[PDB]
Design a protein around this ligand. Structure first.
Ligand SMILES: C[C@@H]1O[C@@H](O[C@@H]2[C@@H](O[C@H]3O[C@H](CO)[C@H](O)[C@H](O)[C@H]3O)[C@@H](O)[C@@H](CO)O[C@@H]2O)[C@@H](O)[C@H](O)[C@@H]1O
Ligand SMILES: C[C@@H]1O[C@@H](O[C@@H]2[C@@H](O[C@H]3O[C@H](CO)[C@H](O)[C@H](O)[C@H]3O)[C@@H](O)[C@@H](CO)O[C@@H]2O)[C@@H](O)[C@H](O)[C@@H]1O
Lengths: 304, 305
């Protein structure tokens, strides 16, 4: 039976699975005051993708499709295509197109477009507000606010590349743990990856944390994912069968050979540590995770 | 001795190692008429990174540092930090900071900045022209043209996120993906490059992993070919499997029929060749993937592609 493994990449060598930016650090904190239900970076240890999770680190929070100008505004409606430009299908049993942002906030980036005939191209700063009434990606359309009211053409391939977040009380947006309504006010979310929470006394989620670029105002730029994108890619390929519900990982300093801490990688795809309170883990930059064994549901971790 | 493998990700499931975008297809063509010497997406099969290649798919063509306004213009000088905000050391024997663009062209994206003190933020459209005299990343500084003349502060962490390429003149004449920038500008010559690559077996051509860069203005050449998917770079770096010869034979397989579409040579020094003459967009099943089959000697003749 094929042995389970995690990548030996260090934290700084890996990518956030909820936004296309590098991981910076490990963070643990209490999460009782909210619902932890991200839809990107969701994958089982035996390699089944969940929620809106797809395999590309650079297609996260991107959109593709065609655009139509909204008269008398600087806004454009995008009718979504799939990430490979064929028709988008709302009957596929996912919450939204794969890689759709999984938090409420205003994401700024650029809309770019190519005219098929002559290869002319154009690019404009654009912002999508995932909390607004027009954010209905599951229905196949979303709205952008842009810096132009006339440059974009109809019936031409258009891409949104995310860059960062904006805010207009400080750090009151984005809300990284609030899911958008993928069908807007017209419906409720469907086929979600489940909420996650520690269930063992003294345990907290371990988050893989990045700082999103801010493009305006005073945004909350903290972004926590449950699994590095490289781990999603790894499990997807390996598809190693899980021999219990909990994989024991040791975080190791490869120079000293010493274990810094141990943690539980849950089969359904998230990590817990034995700690209480908010804490930025102190780790050597060469540190990495090592799978050591499958353990039962009642395994007591050495305290972090 | 640890068995060599390549990832089983399909072409469309992988990332270009020369720009932060998905792979779209496989392309082969003659390359005798130019120098194929990209510096990103360069890695040996036993996992040694070469040129400016680093591990992050999202740090390719990104820059980090602090900026200074150039008075009376919309331009800024960036003093480069390393990708983890450490000092960049120009005496390090690499061509340029890891992830530096390895083509001459105008790259458009956004410059973003956070004021440490109060967490105030700002973001502006910006372009870096890697062929310009002020593009000297090996010296630790580059220049951006931006949409602002006053918003960016000094002494604050500033990041450039690449989006696409622009062209300014003859159509599709820029960027020039096979022309390396002069990393030290007019002040010095490029050093410590990953070697130029070329087929050395009769009837062989390089196999390219191809993407289409977003275009942001004008009529750019948006074709971007890399020698290795970023996921292969990551895979070899981790595995560090010893090469048992200079050439690994790969078969590209249709996992449904189990049938081989073509075979190719993955050279130990990190690039792929196929037996074909002429420009050709490979036609492949979307679920097709590469499979390492054996190390072969220097005299192995590939089946025609
Ligand atoms: C906190 C503040 O965020 C950003 O400023 C925006 C404003 O952006 C506009 O004005 C600013 C400064 O006046 C700047 O000229 C920018 O190019 C321009 O778009 C504006 O959107 C208001 C809304 O009324 O919100 C903020 O004040 C940023 O530019 C600043 O540097 C600063 O971080
Ligand atoms: C081929 C052309 O490329 C882009 O236009 C640019 C120009 O961009 C400027 O003008 C356009 C109006 O066409 C637009 O207002 C844009 O915001 C502005 O920056 C300009 O850079 C010239 C240089 O002289 O080159 C191109 O004409 C694109 O916007 C067009 O749609 C078209 O594809």
């Amino acid at each position: 039976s094929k042995p389970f493994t995690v990548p030996i990449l260090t934290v700084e060598e890996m990518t956030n699975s909820r936004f296309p930016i590098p991981l910076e650090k490990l963070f643990t904190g209490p999460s009782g005051a909210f619902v932890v239900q991200p839809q990107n970076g969701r994958c089982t240890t035996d390699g089944v993708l969940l929620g809106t999770t797809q395999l590309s680190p650079v297609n996260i929070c991107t959109f593709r499709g065609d655009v139509t100008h909204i008269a008398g505004t600087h806004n454009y409606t995008m009718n979504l295509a799939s990430q490979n430009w064929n028709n988008y299908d709302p009957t596929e049993e996912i919450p939204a197109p794969l890689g759709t942002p999984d938090f409420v906030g205003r994401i700024q980036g650029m809309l770019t477009q190519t005219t098929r005939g002559d290869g002319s191209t154009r690019g404009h700063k654009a912002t999508v507000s995932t909390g607004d009434v027009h954010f209905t990606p599951k229905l196949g359309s979303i709205q952008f606010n842009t810096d132009t009211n006339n440059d974009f053409e109809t019936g031409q391939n258009t891409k949104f590349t995310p860059v960062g977040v904006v805010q207009d009380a400080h750090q009151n947006e984005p809300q990284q743990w609030v899911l958008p309504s993928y069908s807007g006010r017209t419906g409720h979310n469907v086929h979600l990856a489940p909420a996650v929470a520690p269930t063992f006394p003294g345990e907290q989620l371990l988050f893989f944390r990045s700082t999103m670029p801010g493009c305006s105002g005073y945004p909350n730029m903290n972004l926590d994912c449950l699994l590095p994108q490289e781990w999603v890619q790894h499990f997807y390929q390996e598809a190693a069968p899980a021999q219990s519900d909990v994989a024991l990982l040791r975080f190791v300093n490869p120079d000293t050979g010493r274990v810094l801490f141990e943690c539980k990688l849950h089969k359904s795809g998230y990590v817990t540590v034995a700690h209480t309170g908010q804490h930025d883990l102190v780790i050597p930059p060469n540190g990495y995770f090592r799978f050591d064994s499958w353990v039962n549901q009642f395994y007591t971790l050495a305290p972090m």
